[PDB]
Amino acid sequence: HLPNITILATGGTIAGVENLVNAVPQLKDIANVKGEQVVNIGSQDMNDNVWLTLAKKINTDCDKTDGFVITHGTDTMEETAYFLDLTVKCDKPVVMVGAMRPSTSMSADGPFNLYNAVVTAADKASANRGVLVVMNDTVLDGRDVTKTNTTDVATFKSVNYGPLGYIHNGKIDYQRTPARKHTSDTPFDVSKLNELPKVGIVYNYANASDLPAKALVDAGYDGIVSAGVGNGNLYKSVFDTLATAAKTGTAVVRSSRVPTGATTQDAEVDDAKYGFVASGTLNPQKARVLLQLALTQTKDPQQIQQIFNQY
Amino acid sequence: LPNITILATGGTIAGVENLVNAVPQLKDIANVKGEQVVNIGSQDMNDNVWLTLAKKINTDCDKTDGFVITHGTDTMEETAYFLDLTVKCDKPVVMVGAMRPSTSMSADGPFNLYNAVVTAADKASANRGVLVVMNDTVLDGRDVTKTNTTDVATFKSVNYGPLGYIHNGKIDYQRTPARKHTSDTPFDVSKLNELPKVGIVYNYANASDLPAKALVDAGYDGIVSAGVGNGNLYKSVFDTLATAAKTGTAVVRSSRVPTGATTQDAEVDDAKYGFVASGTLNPQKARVLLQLALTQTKDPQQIQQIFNQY
Amino acid sequence: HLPNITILATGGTIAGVENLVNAVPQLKDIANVKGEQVVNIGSQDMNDNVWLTLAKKINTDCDKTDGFVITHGTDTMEETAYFLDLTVKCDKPVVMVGAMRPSTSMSADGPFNLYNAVVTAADKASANRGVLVVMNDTVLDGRDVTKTNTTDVATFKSVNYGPLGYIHNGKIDYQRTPARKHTSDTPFDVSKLNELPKVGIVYNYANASDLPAKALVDAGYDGIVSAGVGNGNLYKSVFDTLATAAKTGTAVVRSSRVPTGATTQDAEVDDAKYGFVASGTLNPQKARVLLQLALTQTKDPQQIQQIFNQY
Amino acid sequence: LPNITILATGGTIAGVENLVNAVPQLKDIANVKGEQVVNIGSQDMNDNVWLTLAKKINTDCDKTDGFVITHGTDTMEETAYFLDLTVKCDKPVVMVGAMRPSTSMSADGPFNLYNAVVTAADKASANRGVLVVMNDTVLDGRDVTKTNTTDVATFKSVNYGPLGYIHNGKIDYQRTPARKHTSDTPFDVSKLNELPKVGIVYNYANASDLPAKALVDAGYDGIVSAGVGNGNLYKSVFDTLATAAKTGTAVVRSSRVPTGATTQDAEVDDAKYGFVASGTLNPQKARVLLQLALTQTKDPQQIQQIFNQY
């Protein structure tokens, strides 16, 4: 008896959706695989509608399978993974996987990546660890995982807290699990939502224009995430715009363009004075995910900060 | 002992005249003179300070043996690259800051400043471009970047590595940047009062096109895209920047991904759209080169050549 | 009411033992500190006797304090930390700390390192995580922590599974804990031992002499750890000597000189055929610690392998 | 197309004559000829193979445009440095291997070999020393090391970084090693049948002196210490090596620590004891340089100078 694993595809094939058991025939040795094409897009075009589709599908079909593998482009896999980490209520394994080389190229990584993703989704030890990303023989938690390099097959790393386990010869030695609350331990419930609160991201740098921030404010955005410099700092003109926005109903989260480390609460910005929230180790795109979901529950900055301290 | 000028741009990391008293060991390695150029937090760094610093270094080159610039860490990597392209003095120019306040336990500023002066005093530091010295390491201004929000070891040359390490006041240099810098560039800011307007837009799932449209509507000369993966763009952002490029806006594809190049000949046909690929330059560094490129040319093929040489 | 923290010193001072509350006066704000000089040596001379002294002291004095900080040289801190991780039965916090710069040098790291070590030992959340190392604002588990650079203040990293938490403004956000069994979950009990089994380490490289391995065998060593090349591979002459030793009573553990990754069981060496044990992610010096302790319980290679799979 | 010679030292990574059939895309970039020099696992690499490879490359230099050497990954970093010091051909010499078996899913060997040939065919690769090409990256033979036991991305130049990255068959080189290599070294193995005996001892808590004593008793010409921290030694190991140095044994302090230099002027008075500090050379790389140094001199001051130049 092998586990039933459902592959949900979101784009092109990473090996070579119903043909994957022929493209990677050794999947037969580890699982009974069934494939469904959910959508077909490049992940640079990933969007809220696809996120809601995936969460609802996994939650609806949880009782019909033993685990899920989602094939997904690498560019925004880290965003989808965290969205699902917060909204999936199935605690069976949910594993995302992609490929940094075309499936037609020399030494394509897709085939073995898919094999190892199925290994992970079939391992009972993978349950209750949240939504996972499996790339380059490594199991990574959906919160901390990020794409660190533009081209390397080894690009995906959990840059602050490290991987959960390594895969060798079809076996995983798990030595870690994420302590932040995920899946069925979060209050986020998207089962009935057709849309998510509007949250945009602005970058900070020398001489930064306030026009991007102002355009999101003019459009009535529900939240703005700042990709700050250093420990979440803001260029003066951007600071001025976001200070006004926070006092007129917009939720403002300070994150950082710096690729590792937390944007902390007790540094150079008096968040309580301005009504801002500090993102911790969540990078701008991950902080956007959590802020959108926070905004389904509350608009209060103190309550949003508590959310950013727990999930 | 060599004469070293410390140009301060903010608060102390260890008045500016007092640094020899804060770090008395500096007297054993250099004759130090300090000047306060501006006094701002580096999160508020801007074009006017960049122009002031380049002009000052170029004007005072003959008056000193080397320069150390004290600077906040948040945007040091941007100022370093700007100076790397516009300074024509080939005497050492070294930037330094501190990740812990000078008043805090185990403050890093004192030894960082000591090592920055060591570097500026070392004859072997000349002709290597503008340098950043942090955590016992000499880093080239092009590749150096702040990798962590809090760690004293945050500054790293994440693609090509450091130039040398400092131990007991001595540097073993094993590398130098091949990209053209300082007097090997055509960028000459000596007579400029302002720089071309270049903004940065971020890409992510469901990204709004409104930031890009706002820069276009303001007549920006260039826009850098902090793309996903190998410089890819969310569809609506792509569409806005493609239309803008047809009108003459310079568009550089960079990446929010912290290491690796945004390459030509990947998923985006840059020649078709009139875009430029930034290579290993991250968004804020690509902005620096794009502003300077736009002092010379608006033509995308020529801008691409600049992004392949500097 | 502040916690009672005991500082156990093993060498020179890292800040500036009873004077430390004067060298770092802000310790008064976070703990009631008492210091004891256990030994006074450079950690390059660390040895079994000091290890046994420390474990027995912590176990004896557990009920007299709220947590422990051990000041220790950096060169072998990673070895002592893992030894204590396996032998301490006090589940109150035990934190090791050192300094990469002299306490008299510019920007000495010792003072703040000690402050943060006391913060960690005083945090109730630090309990039950095993023996810890606190360096450069980071809390690291004793198993995976290793010295990665010869001079950098940021040298200590948990290179396979990452840190447990980061320290900012005297507060720790713990997001991980080690899954391998430690402290009171191990069977290793050194309370009555005056000596440990003899275990030496041999290096592998091109053209490697068998003479180091032969000298340990001739001396009747109880175990030998190989610092293998790649995934625990051995130069032919070293392989030949260790194959003979394993069949004549010596325990042989394959580790690797490679600084990250596991020496795995199902690679190029048939460990069952030769009676060898694979060390997993334990580097040679850490594998020595566990092998010495395994040898207090058993000489059987299969049982030693199980130990290397659980601790 | 350039003529590239593939010298194989073990099993295939993608007979040796068949590589153009395993990787047909090689025909689009080079005229490839293969020769099997030896057939061993690289964990069994040894002095005789090193001498064979250096002599073969030096003899056949005029007959080809570049060399690729296929080699096991376990000791590739040692062979690369040996060749980096002894090859006098300044045409490209590139080493390559594979972390996954050629028969396994997503085997890395095929593309690694393709990129190695790209590198050997690129005129810009010349005069950079012996190179290792792995995971789309060109790495200098001195600093390159295997950092992980299993990862395809294991090879990194952990102190000074890579020389260039390979994308779509093109290399952007931004660095070159400053330490002297190839024809800038005095090491000449053309007439040597053997190399001086150099062994490596490890340091750790409670370390036995018996390994060191065994090498001394065998009359080893040199011993490298894999020290703790900045090249420190356990007392009993120290005492044995100090006595041996007084008798003429060459002793190099390296470090088991995987990055950073073993420096002069730290905790060990090298001049007093007659020891040599290895710098950034790890134990196995320090052995390579020490063996070659001992073909020229037994004097510790001269050996230290060699460790400061190569």
Author numbering:
A (entry chain B), C (entry chain B): 0 to 15, 32 to 326
B (entry chain A), D (entry chain A): 1 to 14, 31 to 326
Sentences from the paper on this structure:
The asymmetric unit (ASU) of apo-N24S, solved at 1.70 Å resolution, comprised 4 monomers, named A, B, C, and D. Chains A/B and C/D are associated into two independent intimate dimers. The biological unit was rebuilt using the crystallographic C2 symmetry operators. None of the protomers contained a complete electron density trace in the region corresponding to the extremely mobile active site flexible loop (ASFL). Protomer A missed residues 15–30, protomer B 16–31, protomer C 16–32, and protomer D, the most complete, 15–25. Analysis of the solvent content inside the apo-N24S-binding pocket confirms the presence of the four highly conserved water molecules (named W1–W4) that are known to coordinate and interact with the rigid part of the substrate-binding pocket. As previously observed for the wild-type apo-enzyme, in fact, the position of each of the four water molecules exactly coincides with one of the oxygen atoms of the two carboxylic groups of the bound L-ASP ligand. In ErAII, the C-domain loop establishes contacts only with G28, a residue belonging to the ASFL and not involved in the catalytic process. Such a tight contact between the two monomers in EcAII intimate dimers (present also in the enzyme apo-structure) makes the size of the opening, useful for substrate access and product exiting from the active site, quite narrow.
Bacterial L-asparaginases are amidohydrolases (EC 3.5.1.1) capable of deaminating L-asparagine and, with reduced efficiency, L-glutamine. Bacterial L-asparaginases are homotetrameric proteins of 140–150 kDa. Each subunit is built-up by nearly 330 amino acids and consists of two α/β domains connected by a ca 21 amino-acid-long random coil. To obtain high-quality crystals, we took advantage of the highly stable N24S L-asparaginase, which shares identical catalytic and structural properties with the wild-type enzyme, but has largely improved stability and forms highly ordered crystals.
